[PDB]
């Protein structure tokens, strides 16, 4: 196996794939004028393809991923990197820099089980970015209900939808993708969600998604990501959204956020409770702690419904307001013992639900 490639063509692929010792190695394969680089943890897999325009020789090996990446990144801009398998070592040469890396046999590198695509669609990179960033923060962390640790991806009509929840708060975002889709839902594990996000880059390359019974695959440019799915029964966001949250409050997003952030300073460090007093065109936020310290914030808002008070975990509210990258927020209320729905006043595409505190 031999190839000579420009540093600039290796770097991004190496970074993407680099994200039982052999799991710490990358599989390198030179075949039909292409270098393929594969990384795996048995749960998911990233494969990058790089065209070889310079003379090359076929073959495959595996090499320590972090070391190979660090060597390549460490070389100067515009470096050419010549690679050849010699004996049980992989030689890396650029300029007068030389490196000899250990290898493990390509035959030992694990594969994911073969599977069939049942559901397929294409969508803009920007749409996937939007779907993930709108909801990611609401996924559970290390919950015994394993399926909450991931993210629901649901197709319905022509929309792709993400849902994330930890039982206390929920985020949902739906985006049109302009294709007739089957009604289908799968749960992507949190590490898979992280990877799907990482592969976007923000150019114009579209994303191609294939969904099987136990796998998801995403194709973008010369990269293929495959993950196992998570089994289990994800809650139904329609049951979490308040049935008729007809008390509507509108306020400046950053004004509201900074008021909550200040009140938070004097909330209970563990329980993080704050109280909201809603009245005609006014919101009052209060907080107190076991040390008897108190915060009070008063803001002007647009509100014409009945007066009510409601308690919330301020961290959950802040998370939502930080995820809303917008000018004005709408809060949609029911009563003191029911959830609040929060949205961008200018867009219905994402919705957030926070359960109250007694």
């Amino acid at each position: 196996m031999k190839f000579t490639v420009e540093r600039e063509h290796l770097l991004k692929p190496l970074q993407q794939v680099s994200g039982l010792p052999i799991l710490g190695n990358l599989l390198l394969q030179v075949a039909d004028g292409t270098l393929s680089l594969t990384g795996t943890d048995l749960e998911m897999e990233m494969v990058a393809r790089v065209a070889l325009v310079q003379p090359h020789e076929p073959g495959a090996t595996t090499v320590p991923a972090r070391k190979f990446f660090d060597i390549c990144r460490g070389l100067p801009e515009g470096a050419e990197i010549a690679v050849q398998l010699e004996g049980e070592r992989m030689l890396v040469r650029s300029g007068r820099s030389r490196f000899s890396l250990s290898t493990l046999p390509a035959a030992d590198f694990p594969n994911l089980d073969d599977w069939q695509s049942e559901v397929e669609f294409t969508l803009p990179q920007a749409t996937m970015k939007r779907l993930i960033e709108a909801t990611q923060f609401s996924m559970a962390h290390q919950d015994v209900r394993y399926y909450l640790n991931g993210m629901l991806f649901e197709t319905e009509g022509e929309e792709l939808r993400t849902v994330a929840t930890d039982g206390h708060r929920l985020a949902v975002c739906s985006m049109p993708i302009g294709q007739s889709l089957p009604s289908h839902s799968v749960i992507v594990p949190r590490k898979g969600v992280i990877e799907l996000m990482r592969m976007l880059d923000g150019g114009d390359n579209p994303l191609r998604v294939q969904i099987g019974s136990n796998n998801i695959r995403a194709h973008v440019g010369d990269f293929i990501f495959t993950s196992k799915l998570v089994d289990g029964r994800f809650p139904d966001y329609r049951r979490v959204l308040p049935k008729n949250p007809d008390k509507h409050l509108e306020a400046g997003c950053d004004l509201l956020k900074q008021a909550f952030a200040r009140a938070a300073i004097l909330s209970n460090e563990k329980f993080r409770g704050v109280r909201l007093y809603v009245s005609e065109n006014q919101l009052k936020i209060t907080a107190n702690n076991p040390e008897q310290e108190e915060a009070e914030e008063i803001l002007d808002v647009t509100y014409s419904g009945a007066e009510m008070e409601i308690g919330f975990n301020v961290s959950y509210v802040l998370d939502v307001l930080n995820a809303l990258k917008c000018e004005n927020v709408r809060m949609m209320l029911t009563d003191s013992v029911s959830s609040v729905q929060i949205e961008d006043a200018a867009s219905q595409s994402a919705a957030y639900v926070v359960m109250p505190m007694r």
């Binding site: 206390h168 139904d236 049951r239 975990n313 013992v337 639900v353 359960m355 505190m357 007694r358």
Partner: peptide, 5 residues
């Protein structure tokens, strides 16, 4: 803290 579901 109340639960959603």
């Amino acid at each position: 803290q109340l639960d959603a579901f």
